[PDB]
Design an enzyme around this catalytic site. Structure first.
Site, short mmCIF file in Angstrom:
data_model
loop_
_atom_site.label_atom_id
_atom_site.label_comp_id
_atom_site.label_asym_id
_atom_site.label_seq_id
_atom_site.Cartn_x
_atom_site.Cartn_y
_atom_site.Cartn_z
CD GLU A 27 -31.22 44.77 -9.12
OE1 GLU A 27 -30.18 45.48 -9.20
OE2 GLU A 27 -31.19 43.61 -8.76
CG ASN A 65 -24.10 43.37 -1.36
OD1 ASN A 65 -25.00 43.12 -0.52
ND2 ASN A 65 -23.45 42.43 -2.03
N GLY A 103 -17.26 54.40 4.10
CA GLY A 103 -16.88 55.47 3.19
C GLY A 103 -16.39 55.14 1.80
CD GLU A 123 -11.74 48.94 8.81
OE1 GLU A 123 -12.01 48.83 7.59
OE2 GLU A 123 -10.57 49.11 9.21
NE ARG A 173 -12.82 45.57 6.54
CZ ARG A 173 -13.65 46.25 5.77
NH1 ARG A 173 -14.05 45.74 4.61
NH2 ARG A 173 -14.08 47.46 6.17
CG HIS A 229 -15.58 42.86 -1.43
ND1 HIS A 229 -16.40 43.87 -1.91
CD2 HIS A 229 -14.59 42.71 -2.35
CE1 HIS A 229 -15.91 44.34 -3.05
NE2 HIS A 229 -14.81 43.65 -3.34
CD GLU A 277 -18.55 42.38 -3.95
OE1 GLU A 277 -19.27 43.36 -3.63
OE2 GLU A 277 -18.44 41.36 -3.24
CB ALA A 303 -15.91 48.11 -2.53
C1 FAD Z 1 -23.20 45.86 4.35
C2 FAD Z 1 -22.10 46.26 3.40
C3 FAD Z 1 -21.45 47.40 3.67
C4 FAD Z 1 -20.35 47.82 2.74
N1 FAD Z 1 -19.66 49.06 3.02
C5 FAD Z 1 -18.70 49.52 2.23
C6 FAD Z 1 -18.10 50.89 2.52
O1 FAD Z 1 -18.32 51.68 3.35
N2 FAD Z 1 -17.10 51.25 1.65
C7 FAD Z 1 -16.71 50.38 0.57
O2 FAD Z 1 -15.81 50.75 -0.11
N3 FAD Z 1 -17.33 49.11 0.31
C8 FAD Z 1 -18.26 48.75 1.08
N4 FAD Z 1 -18.84 47.56 0.76
C9 FAD Z 1 -18.49 46.82 -0.46
C10 FAD Z 1 -19.45 47.41 -1.50
O3 FAD Z 1 -20.68 48.21 -1.07
C11 FAD Z 1 -19.88 46.41 -2.59
O4 FAD Z 1 -18.54 46.04 -3.05
C12 FAD Z 1 -20.51 47.19 -3.85
O5 FAD Z 1 -21.84 47.15 -3.33
C13 FAD Z 1 -20.19 46.68 -5.19
O6 FAD Z 1 -21.17 47.47 -5.94
P1 FAD Z 1 -21.62 46.92 -7.35
O7 FAD Z 1 -22.32 47.98 -8.07
O8 FAD Z 1 -20.48 46.17 -7.94
O9 FAD Z 1 -22.67 45.74 -6.92
P2 FAD Z 1 -24.03 45.76 -6.05
O10 FAD Z 1 -24.16 47.05 -5.43
O11 FAD Z 1 -23.98 44.49 -5.30
O12 FAD Z 1 -25.08 45.68 -7.21
C14 FAD Z 1 -25.15 44.68 -8.27
C15 FAD Z 1 -26.62 44.50 -8.56
O13 FAD Z 1 -26.82 43.59 -9.68
C16 FAD Z 1 -27.78 42.67 -9.45
N5 FAD Z 1 -27.77 41.58 -10.31
C17 FAD Z 1 -26.95 40.52 -10.09
N6 FAD Z 1 -27.02 39.61 -11.02
C18 FAD Z 1 -27.96 40.10 -11.93
C19 FAD Z 1 -28.55 39.66 -13.15
N7 FAD Z 1 -28.21 38.47 -13.70
N8 FAD Z 1 -29.49 40.49 -13.73
C20 FAD Z 1 -29.86 41.63 -13.25
N9 FAD Z 1 -29.35 42.15 -12.07
C21 FAD Z 1 -28.42 41.32 -11.48
C22 FAD Z 1 -28.29 42.82 -7.99
O14 FAD Z 1 -29.13 41.81 -7.38
C23 FAD Z 1 -27.52 43.98 -7.41
O15 FAD Z 1 -28.70 44.86 -7.11
C24 FAD Z 1 -19.96 47.05 1.57
C25 FAD Z 1 -20.69 45.84 1.30
C26 FAD Z 1 -21.72 45.50 2.22
C27 FAD Z 1 -22.43 44.23 1.88
O1 FUM Z 2 -18.02 50.15 6.67
C1 FUM Z 2 -17.37 49.02 6.56
O2 FUM Z 2 -16.98 48.38 7.50
C2 FUM Z 2 -17.08 48.46 5.24
C3 FUM Z 2 -15.99 48.83 4.57
C4 FUM Z 2 -15.76 48.24 3.25
O3 FUM Z 2 -16.25 47.02 3.00
O4 FUM Z 2 -15.12 48.80 2.38
NA NA Z 3 -14.59 41.11 -7.36
#
Ligand code: FAD
Ligand code: FUM
Ligand code: NA
Ligand code: HEM
Ligand code: HEM
Ligand code: HEM
Ligand code: HEM
Length: 568
Positions: A156, A164, A171, A378, A402, A505, A534, A549
């Protein structure tokens, strides 16, 4: 004293913090943080001494064990990580103002001498799989790879875990779960597929959406077996039925799921390294993965020899410059994102030969708190809140797409709107108490008083809620065709939250197949290279459904770890 080390060395030797030889233990500063704790106590123990009524630097919603050095450096002034989204009244000794200026992957080409030296050395570690990113996708891959018998390092770049994903609220979508069945909900993986395809304007890769819907139940089962509570099942826009799974009482899904994954990683003894950024995927003379060059903040450049590298780095929604080039309508908007969510993992993917797709499709979340600058879930609308403009009127189906919700809010006087709700909505979703604690949900015993407090027409607001509640009882919203009307707003006090759209997103990213294998522009697999969460494109098409997500990152993360371990 100008710095924290200077303060301590007035009365302490170097080796009160350092190892015997003085060298830094590792990039997580494990040994050094252990010394902070030996004298000050754990983060929880420090938190006892730093309480404010509504916040505490040492007791936050962050999961995992947050290292002291995330905010307290020794030999220079340091930033409070919380300052990247909030502006609490803090008085941290030796603080400096929050600034994120992280070099891009391209700028790091200027470290050629150091990088060449690193690559000329032995690999610091030889393992089976390296996972990059400690969000939901990366922990899921690290755990599933380990359970498949692979040796894993998880890195990390940030000082703290979770990306995120730790912020997720509304949910985790799935069908047809035991959790739904226990709540008298009827669903199917086919209905989920069909909602998802429709939601993304049929732009989604159908093969990826089929993995998403068909694995979704098993992913809820997998998380539950690891100790997660996903028993509360809420509604979010674009879903035909309630399928957004989260903890009891409607708490946030994100911090919880990430904490569970963390605990499960620690239990399996997974090598997790903080402040360690993946720089460059290394390929052999035949174009297959041979390892990865990394940059540790403290220990410098080094490389890991590995058969497989899983990119699990998240999106780029925090990077407004990159966002605006792809979607000019989002230029200058605030983001819901963590400070590191800038798309450098996509740069790493492309440099390794990976093609990107669907990059132009960027989601604005309709409801950022104007006052707090943070996402308002939401789920607040899903559980029954409405939106009003300053004129005190409804103006949109609150659970529309959205992009349309955002457009609607920006079309209103002042370019913002208000979530309006009562105590029955509040009690149905404990996450709402978090907004009240933040101070962004002003309250009154009448809507006339509330409207007067907030600059909303108070008589019109009164009449709007009386009219909406009538629509709820009759079961049809003949005004905006809101398809789900769960609650009348008529219990106890009333709350307003001023809201406005923010960048949330990024639906595009690296092309993967159904095995989470990364492909080039010719659609040829790059052997040993994987992508999950993501960071990828194709799953969500032109628009992502809320809840989809968290579903994606667990499903694709877990699958990538299994595939990478078998590849080996
Ligand atoms: C406030 C918020 C609320 C959300 N709520 C929802 C919800 O209720 N339901 C839903 O379905 N989606 C939700 N989403 C969308 C979802 O949480 C994100 O899509 C999800 O976090 C994607 O997870 P991930 O593991 O792909 O990436 P992340 O959780 O973003 O993690 C990726 C990680 O990799 C890292 N990283 C990046 N580049 C490098 C590198 N070169 N080397 C080492 N580490 C690196 C970090 O900095 C980060 O810690 C939300 C997003 C946000 C911002
Ligand atoms: O709790 C939210 O609004 C986020 C939903 C999502 O990005 O999937
Ligand atoms: Na993507
Ligand atoms: C590890 C790097 C570490 C940190 C971080 C830390 C924090 C810290 C702060 C923020 C202060 C306040 C400084 C100021 O007021 O200007 C503070 C002060 C004291 N500390 Fe500390 N501390 C770290 C490490 C250690 C270690 C290894 C020891 C002892 C062996 C130690 C002890 C103390 C003492 C004593 C003080 C003065 C205040 C008090 O609690 O009596 N800390 N530290
Ligand atoms: C005692 C006077 C003392 C010395 C000497 C010393 C050295 C030192 C160096 C050379 C580094 C950088 C090493 C590298 O880049 O590889 C470094 C970094 C950190 N230190 Fe230190 N240090 C001395 C004292 C103390 C004390 C009293 C503490 C704790 C309060 C402390 C801790 C740390 C930490 C943490 C780091 C990482 C970078 C940073 O936070 O500044 N040291 N130190
Ligand atoms: C840093 C460690 C940090 C702290 C401390 C902190 C506190 C905090 C409080 C007190 C609230 C109100 C609700 C509660 O008591 O839990 C709150 C709410 C939200 N925050 Fe936060 N927060 C810290 C850091 C960060 C950062 C770095 C981000 C964004 C990447 C962020 C985001 C949010 C969001 C969103 C909320 C709304 C309520 C919720 O989602 O639970 N916080 N935070
Ligand atoms: C790690 C467990 C850790 C320690 C130890 C630590 C120490 C520490 C002290 C001793 C103080 C001063 C307390 C006092 O009032 O005398 C202090 C204050 C603040 N800190 Fe801290 N701290 C640890 C960890 C962290 C982390 C991970 C963060 C950021 C997320 C952080 C930040 C802060 C802030 C802000 C303050 C000022 C508190 C306030 O003004 O209310 N610390 N810390």
């Amino acid at each position: 004293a100008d710095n924290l080390a200077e303060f301590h060395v007035q009365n302490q030797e170097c080796d009160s913090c350092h190892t015997p030889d003085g060298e830094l233990s590792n990039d997580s500063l494990t040994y050094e943080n252990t010394q902070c704790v030996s004298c000050h106590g754990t983060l929880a123990e420090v938190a006892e001494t730093t309480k404010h009524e509504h916040y505490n630097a040492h007791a936050s919603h962050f999961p995992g064990e947050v290292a002291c050095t995330s905010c307290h450096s020794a030999h220079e002034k340091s930033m409070v990580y919380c300052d990247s989204c909030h502006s609490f009244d803090f008085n941290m000794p030796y603080a400096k103002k929050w600034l994120r200026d992280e070099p891009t992957i391209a700028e790091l080409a200027k470290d050629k001498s150091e990088r060449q030296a690193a690559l000329a050395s032995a690999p610091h570690d030889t393992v089976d799989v390296v996972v990059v990113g400690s969000g939901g996708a990366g922990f899921s891959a690290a755990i599933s790879a380990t359970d498949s018998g692979a040796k894993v390092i998880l890195i990390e770049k940030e000082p703290v875990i979770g990306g995120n994903a730790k912020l997720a609220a509304g949910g985790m979508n799935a069908a047809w779960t035991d959790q739904q069945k226990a709540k008298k909900i009827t669903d199917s993986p086919e209905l989920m597929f069909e909602d998802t395809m429709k939601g993304g304007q049929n732009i989604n890769d159908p093969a990826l959406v089929k993995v998403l819907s068909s694995h979704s139940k098993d992913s809820v089962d997998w998380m539950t077996a690891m100790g997660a509570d996903l028993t509360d099942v809420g509604m979010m826009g674009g879903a035909s039925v309630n399928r957004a799974h989260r903890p009891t009482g409607g708490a946030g899904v994100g911090a919880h799921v990430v904490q569970v994954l963390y605990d499960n990683a620690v239990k399996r003894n997974i090598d997790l390294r903080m402040n360690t950024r993946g720089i460059e995927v290394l390929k052999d003379d035949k174009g297959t993965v041979k390892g990865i060059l990394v940059k540790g903040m403290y220990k410098g450049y080094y490389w890991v020899k590995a058969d497989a590298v899983i990119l699990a780095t998240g999106g780029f929604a925090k990077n407004n410059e990159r966002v605006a080039k792809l979607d000019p309508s989002l230029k200058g908007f605030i983001s819901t994102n963590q400070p590191g969510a800038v798309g450098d993992g996509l740069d790493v993917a492309e440099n390794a030969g990976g093609a990107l797709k669907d990059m132009q499709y960027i989601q604005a979340h309709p409801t950022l708190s104007v006052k707090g600058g943070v996402m308002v879930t939401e789920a607040v609308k899903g559980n029954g809140a409405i939106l009003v403009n300053r004129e005190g009127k409804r103006f949109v189906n609150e659970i529309t797409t959205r992009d349309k919700a955002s457009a609607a809010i920006l079309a209103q006087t002042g370019k913002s709107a208000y979530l309006i709700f009562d105590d029955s909505v509040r009690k149905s979703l404990s996450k709402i108490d978090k907004y009240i604690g933040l101070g962004v949900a002003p309250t009154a015993d009448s809507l006339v008083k509330l409207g007067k407090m907030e600059g909303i027409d108070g008589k019109a607001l009164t009449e709007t809620v009386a009219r909406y509640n009538s629509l709820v009882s009759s079961g049809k919203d003949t005004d905006f065709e809101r398809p789900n009307l769960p609650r009348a707003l008529n219990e106890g006090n009333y709350y307003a939250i001023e809201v406005t759209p923010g960048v949330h997103h990024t639906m595009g990213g690296v092309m993967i197949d159904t095995k989470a294998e990364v492909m080039n522009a010719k659609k040829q697999v790059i052997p040993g290279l994987y992508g999950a969460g993501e960071v990828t494109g194709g799953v969500h098409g032109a628009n992502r459904l809320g809840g989809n997500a968290i579903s994606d990152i667990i499903t694709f993360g877990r699958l990538a770890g299994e595939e990478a371990a078998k590849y080996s």
